[PDB]
């Protein structure tokens, strides 16, 4: 049977605010036949709240030596004022926890488009440290941040607001995630 990929995160993993099927997770699920994606994303979620989601799943999870676990979070924490050290440290805890039940894939969260000279710098600092951690531990990374930054910079309409992708932004993210998921 299929591979299982379990996805955790906030509203940008859940797919706010487009029809079911058009968030990036769901695009990926419709694009790969023998990989089944389950979305545990939760709107409004903080990085510590995601840990709780992972724990509540992990205590019920069957052993599965081909499972992958996708994680991405921290935007809400950054919007509420937390610094890159807090966000990064808490994500590492999530990554260590998820690693006990599957092979982890890390997503680099997208830009804070309302504050490219303030809050977005925290996002960038988190993402640099994540790339360094993943290289050290041989964990796959999906760089969503770069995908949408480049597209928006050239004039593609990809954001519906200060952080949420629109449908175009979710398609571009799905393509970028598929570069990793397809090779598993
Ligand atoms: Na599928």
Buried b (16+ CB within 10 A) or exposed e, 61-95: eeeeeebbbbbbbbbbbbbeebebebbbebbeebb
Other beta carbons less than 10 A from residue 136's beta carbon: 8
User: Cα separation of 2 and 36, whole Å?
Assistant: 6
CB 67 within 8 A of CB 4: yes
Edge-to-edge strand ranges of the sheet holding 3-9: 35-39, 3-9, 68-72, 103-108, 140-143
Give residue 24 CA to ligand 1 midpoint distance, Å: 13
Q: Could you tell me which of 44, 125, 144 has the C-alpha nearest to residue 83?
A: 125
Task: Measure Cα distances from 63 to 3, 37, 59 in Å.
Answer: 13, 17, 11
Residues 89, 47: contact at Cβ < 8 Å? Answer: no
What is residue 140's DSSP assignment?
Answer: E
State in Å: Cα 36 to ligand 1 middle.
4
- State how far the Cα of 65 lies from the Cα of 184, in Å rounded to an integer: 13
Q: How far is the CA of 37 from the centre of ligand 1 (A)?
A: 7
Give the C-alpha separation, 62 to 65, whole Å. Answer: 10
CA of 5 to the centre of ligand 1 (A): 10
Phi, psi (degrees; rounded to nearest 5) at 15 = 100, 45
Please name the method used to determine this structure. Answer: X-ray
Q: Cα separation of 46 and 80, whole Å? A: 10
State the virtual CA torsion across 41, 43, 49, 55 in degrees, nearest 10: -30
Give dist(CA 111, CA 115) in Å, integer: 9
C-alpha span between 73 and 9 (Å, rounded): 5
Tokens representing residue 57 in the block: 């799943």
DSSP annotation of 61 reads P
d(CA 122, CA 125): 5
Q: For residues 102 and 67, is the Cβ–Cβ distance under 8 A?
A: yes
Q: Where are the domains of the chain?
A: 1-184
Q: Are 18 and 160 in contact (CB under 8 A)?
A: no
Which pair of tokens denotes residue 36?
Answer: 């089944």
Q: What are the backbone dihedrals phi and psi of residue 81, each rounded to the nearest 5 degrees, phi first? A: 110, 0
- Cα angle value 70/91/140 (rounded, 5°): 40
Is the CB of residue 48 less than 8 Å from the CB of residue 90?
yes
What was the resolution (in A) of this experimentally determined structure? Answer: 2.0
Superfamily name with CATH number, domain 1-184: SGNH hydrolase (3.40.50.1110)
Tokens of 140: 């796959």
Separation of CA 3 and ligand 1 centre (Å): 9
CA of 68 to the centre of ligand 1 (A): 14
């Amino acid at each position: 049977n299929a591979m299982e990929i379990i996805c955790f995160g906030d509203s940008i993993t859940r797919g706010y605010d487009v029809p079911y099927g058009r968030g990036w997770v769901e695009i990926c699920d419709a694009s790969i036949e023998n990989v089944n994606f389950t979305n545990y994303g939760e709107d409004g979620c903080s990085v510590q709240g995601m840990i709780y989601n992972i724990e509540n799943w992990a205590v019920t999870a069957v052993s599965d030596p081909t499972r992958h676990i996708f994680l991405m979070c921290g935007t809400n924490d950054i919007l509420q004022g937390r610094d890159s050290t807090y966000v990064y440290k808490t994500l590492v805890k999530a990554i260590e926890l998820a690693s006990t039940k599957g092979m982890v894939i890390i997503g680099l969260e997208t830009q804070i488009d309302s504050d490219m000279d303030g809050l977005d710098l925290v996002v960038r600092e988190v993402n640099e440290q994540l790339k360094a951690y993943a290289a050290e531990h041989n964990i796959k990374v999906i760089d969503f941040y770069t995908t949408l930054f480049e597209a928006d910079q050239i004039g593609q309409i990809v954001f519906a607001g200060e952080v949420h992708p629109n449908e175009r932004g979710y398609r571009l993210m799905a393509y970028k995630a598929l570069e990793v998921f397809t090779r598993l």
